């Protein structure tokens, strides 16, 4: 346990210690952290302390992407959180915690369970300070990876879980074999890793769905989603002979996605060749390319995950919530951080991003912080704001001239490629601003770009592909067949005088509603 | 009086109906047998097509 | 903040957002004018109905549209549609909103600059731009190469791209249109005894237009055709009943835009006209020219017009080139979605023509500069 | 009693005339939609035709 400033360093020890149990440690209640030994029960107990005093939520944000540690201290800390402040909470939020690990959790090149979303655990405390329910809630998810991973990765969990034909009532009920190599949208990387078992973490996350109050229905509906996610994936469609049109070939996979989500094979086809639009008054088709076809598919199937996911959040908050109507709450992020690999995408940009605006966050509160301090001690002394000033000109990628702009007009304009993308960047950037750099692409090492000066260094970035994935036109023909399906969990997840989308955009308004609720 | 005038004029009314019904059953198998037509029509031009792509390469 | 797209046409306007996939308001460009007495004292009456209210009533009005050719012809009939436009149908405040206007090719430069000098002074837009309808139809149709024929109600006209850069003299404007077909239809719909003089009586034969008319793939034998047997014949209902058929009327009236003869013009058809814009341009373009028609505007939406223009292209070019016109099944509205698209894009935001430009280089700016 | 059962026997029919309608202008609609464009693409088969007659030749 150390303290840096105002972070609290802990590492971890890989061997078991009575330092955290029994409370013959936990005497920290009443002491403040200047005086007693430095621990994140000190921490715990000052947000306690603060949250009696004060009326304002605290918030407590725990460095995610290291496999180990984290995790531990979140069990200790919430375990802490129930001791102080006395089918208990923690029990209930490590019961239906497999559905998030298959659902969020994905094979990394760094790692092997890796958090690929935002997890903002809220323990909500009584009008006094007595411990009430505590509910989860999700931001930013990386939602890319449904359709696309990279070479040596592979996306979620679950659909390996699911395809290593471990109930075979399932890969019956699916209409679905066990090749992995078969699905394109699973097979891009590598299909398993040696270093865990698919059955059994299949057998955690059924025994979670029962712990859950999910019925019969609300499993099978939910395999039943995730077989069509994978169908989805190969779909063929041909340009219709000499005209343009995208048409279909075969109708394999059609029928079966069509009969899993409830909905008709030819309604579907048509929807997603024939799309129509609403002139003012009137409908009108709009053609469709074969490339378009395909976004549309991938739009459709990402938003269908994430719907899901959501539905399910929603699920084990009401399932873990039965509380009278209580005031205050303790804030616990679990989120990735930043990242350097060898080889940097659109994935890592946004990560990074996300990691920038969290460390402005961070920087504006030790100002402040100095700030109060100084004018407590009189000491005249006063410096260019501490908080934002550093990485507000590292926010190019927000700015509606830099990347992520950038990236959309690329995205809206015809015929463009990802080297117009590139000499667009260039032209806009190269030379007029400091924190843009050309790469030193030295030969023997992968290629770069372009390189952005961050906080945590001079990261660079190999922009090849990010056109297809920011593209995100959603199909609402095929949405509005879906709100009339069979199968009422899909009905219920598409309950609620648009080709514009791109994933940099609800990115961006996903990160400017976390750092919102944060502030 | 007027109870039967609108029996007779929708007796009417109703043999109208029979035309137009006729006619739609008439107007179902044109389509179906003009889409045959006109799909076997199709099969004739990709084949074509393709004689032409190929032996114009070979050209 | 969003902007607006305006995209006036002369035969309808249509308005919306820039950012949507299809304008958001989509009425006739029409103002219409009490004819008869009135006598029912307190009824309300009004001194002008516009857009489709103008329509319904159209009983008992004269209308008269506010753009003939292209040009506006009447300021105040346009002033009139544009507020009906902003603050009844889109419900909007147009000082809060940069607007995108829209103008055929080759039209007075007075025309533009009443554009601008309407738009600032009597509406305080805080910025707006003028662009040209073939370019946003490119756009709309995803291309940067092509010559694109637009066809609405006022004019029709090509413009030949090439990566992006324009072929300012090899631009051909043609003054046949939607308009001239309804009259060349309401002038041949007498030699059958019906008669439309008013002008709702025009605006029904422009319905007759737009539900039977096609474009014969071979005028003559089509006509032979039609001589022979009976099966050309359809019928239309009047909004009186009495029913009305035509023969070969459905394909007579299109055919004008290949034969501008039948109305006492002397140009060439639209194929003609294409054929020459692109043999106008720079031998190494007009083989990618050849293969990129792109259809745009109402008046292309008839049936079997893009086969008519491509055999008609194709036996005018050489017999090596691949002829390929491209019509879009929404291209009617392929104007507007290129303009939302365009007034979109992040680097478009240096081209608009702000308030503080206008008043210091008065309405000649936007053609100087814009 | 007769005359509005009778009225109302009728109106249902004549709302069934009414779609019945409807139906058969859409499928003569499509039968024409697809008869002009099979024989449009019937000219396009000829001319496909006589350029692999010429090929022959060229052959
Ligand atoms: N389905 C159709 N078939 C044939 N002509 C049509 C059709 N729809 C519209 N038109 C013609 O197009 C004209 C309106 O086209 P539009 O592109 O809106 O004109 P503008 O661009 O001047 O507003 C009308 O005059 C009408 O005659």
Redesign the pocket.
């Known amino acids: 346990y150390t303290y840096s400033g105002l972070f609290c360093v802990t590492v971890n020890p890989y061997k078991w210690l009575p330092v955290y149990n029994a409370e013959v440690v936990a005497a920290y209640r009443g002491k403040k952290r200047s005086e007693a030994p430095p621990h994140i029960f000190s921490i715990s107990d000052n947000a306690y302390q603060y949250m009696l005093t004060d009326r304002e939520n605290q918030s407590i944000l725990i460095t995610g992407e290291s496999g180990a540690g984290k995790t531990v201290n979140t069990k200790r800390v919430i375990q802490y959180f129930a001791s102080i402040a006395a089918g208990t909470l923690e029990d209930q939020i490590i019961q239906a915690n497999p559905a998030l690990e298959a659902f969020g959790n994905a094979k990394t090149v760094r790692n092997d369970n890796s958090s690929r979303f935002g997890k903002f655990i809220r323990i909500h405390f009584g009008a006094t300070g007595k411990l009430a329910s505590a509910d989860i809630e999700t931001y930013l998810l990386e939602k890319s990876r449904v359709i696309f991973q990279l070479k040596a990765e592979r996306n979620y969990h679950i659909f390996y879980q699911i395809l290593s034909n471990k109930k075979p009532e399932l890969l019956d009920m699916l209409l679905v074999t066990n090749n992995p190599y078969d699905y394109a949208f699973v097979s891009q990387g590598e299909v398993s890793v040696a270093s865990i078992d698919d059955s059994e973490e299949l057998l955690a996350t059924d025994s979670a769905f029962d712990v859950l109050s999910f019925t019969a229905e609300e499993k099978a509906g939910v395999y039943k989603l995730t077989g069509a996610i994978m169908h989805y994936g190969n779909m063929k469609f041909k340009q219709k002979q000499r005209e343009e049109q995208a048409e279909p070939d075969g109708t394999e996979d059609a029928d079966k996605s069509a009969y899993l989500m409830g909905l008709n094979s030819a309604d579907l086809l048509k929807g997603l060749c024939h799309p129509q639009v609403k002139v003012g008054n009137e409908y009108v088709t709009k053609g469709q390319s074969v490339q378009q076809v395909y976004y549309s598919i991938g739009a459709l199937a990402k938003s269908v995950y994430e719907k899901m996911f959501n539905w399910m959040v929603t699920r084990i908050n009401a399932t873990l919530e039965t509380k009278q109507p209580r005031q205050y709450f303790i804030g616990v992020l679990d989120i990735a951080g930043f990242e350097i690999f060898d080889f940097n995408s659109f994935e890592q940009l946004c990560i990074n991003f996300t990691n920038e605006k969290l460390q402005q966050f961070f920087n504006h509160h030790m100002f402040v912080l100095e700030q109060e301090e100084y004018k407590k001690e009189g000491i005249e002394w006063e410096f260019i704001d501490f908080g934002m000033d550093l990485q507000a000109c590292i926010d190019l990628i927000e700015k509606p001239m830099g990347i992520m702009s950038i990236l959309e007009e690329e995205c809206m304009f015809p015929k463009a490629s990802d080297m117009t993308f590139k000499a667009k960047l260039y032209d806009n950037h190269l030379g007029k601003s400091n924190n843009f750099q050309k790469p030193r692409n030295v030969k023997g090492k992968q290629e770069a770009h372009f390189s952005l000066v961050h906080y945590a260094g001079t990261v660079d970035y190999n922009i090849m592909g990010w056109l297809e994935k920011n593209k995100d036109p959603l199909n609402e023909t095929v949405v509005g067949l879906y709100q009339k399906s069979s199968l009422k969990l899909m009905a219920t997840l598409f309950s609620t005088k648009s080709s514009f989308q791109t994933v940099s955009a609800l990115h961006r308004e996903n990160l400017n509603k976390l750092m919102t609720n944060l502030k | 009086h007027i109870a039967e005038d609108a029996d007779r004029k929708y007796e009417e009314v109703a043999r109208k109906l029979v035309i137009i019904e006729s006619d739609l059953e008439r107007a179902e198998e044109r389509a179906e047998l003009s889409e045959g037509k006109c799909a076997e029509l199709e099969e004739e031009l990709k084949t074509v097509t393709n004689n032409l792509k190929s032996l114009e390469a070979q050209a | 903040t969003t902007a607006l797209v305006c995209?006036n046409?002369?035969?309808?306007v249509?308005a919306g957002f820039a950012g949507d996939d299809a304008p958001r308001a989509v009425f006739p460009?029409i103002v219409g004018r009490p004819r008869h007495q009135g006598v029912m004292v307190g009824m309300g009456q009004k001194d002008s109905y516009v857009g489709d209210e103008a329509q319904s009533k159209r009983g008992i009005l004269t209308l008269k549209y506010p753009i003939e050719h292209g040009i506006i012809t009447n300021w105040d009939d346009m002033e009139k549609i544009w507020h009906h436009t902003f603050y009844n149908e889109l419900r909007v405040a147009p000082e809060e909103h940069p607007t995108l206007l829209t103008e055929a090719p080759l039209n007075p430069k007075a025309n533009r600059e009443k554009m601008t000098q309407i738009m600032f002074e009597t509406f305080n837009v805080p910025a707006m731009y003028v662009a040209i309808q073939a370019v946003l139809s490119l756009y709309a149709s995803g291309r940067t190469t092509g010559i694109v024929l637009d066809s609405?109600?006022?004019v029709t006209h090509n413009v030949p791209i090439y990566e992006g850069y324009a072929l300012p003299h090899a631009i051909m404007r043609l003054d046949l249109?939607?308009?001239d077909?309804?009259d060349y239809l309401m002038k041949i719909l007498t030699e059958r005894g019906y008669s439309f003089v008013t002008t709702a009586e025009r605006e029904i034969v422009?319905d007759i237009?737009?539900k039977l008319?096609y474009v014969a793939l071979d005028f003559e034998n089509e006509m032979a055709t039609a001589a022979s047997s009976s099966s050309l014949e359809k019928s239309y209902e009047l909004p009186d009943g009495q029913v009305i058929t035509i023969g070969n009327e459905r394909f007579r009236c299109p055919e004008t835009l290949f034969q501008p003869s039948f109305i006492g013009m002397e140009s060439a058809g639209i194929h003609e006209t294409t054929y020459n814009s692109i043999m106008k341009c720079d031998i190494d373009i007009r083989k990618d020219l050849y293969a990129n028609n792109v259809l745009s505007?109402?008046?292309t939406?008839?049936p079997g017009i893009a086969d008519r223009m491509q055999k008609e292209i194709t036996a005018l070019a050489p017999s090596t080139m691949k002829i390929k016109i491209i019509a879009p099944p929404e291209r009617?509205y392929s104007?507007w979605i290129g303009g939302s698209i365009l007034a979109s894009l992040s680097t478009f935001q240096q081209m608009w023509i702000s308030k503080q430009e206008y008043d210091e280089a008065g309405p000649s700016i936007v053609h100087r500069k814009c």
């Open positions: 995209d046409g002369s035969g309808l249509k460009s609405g109600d006022g249109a939607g308009r077909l309804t422009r237009k737009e008319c505007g109402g008046t939406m008839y009617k104007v």
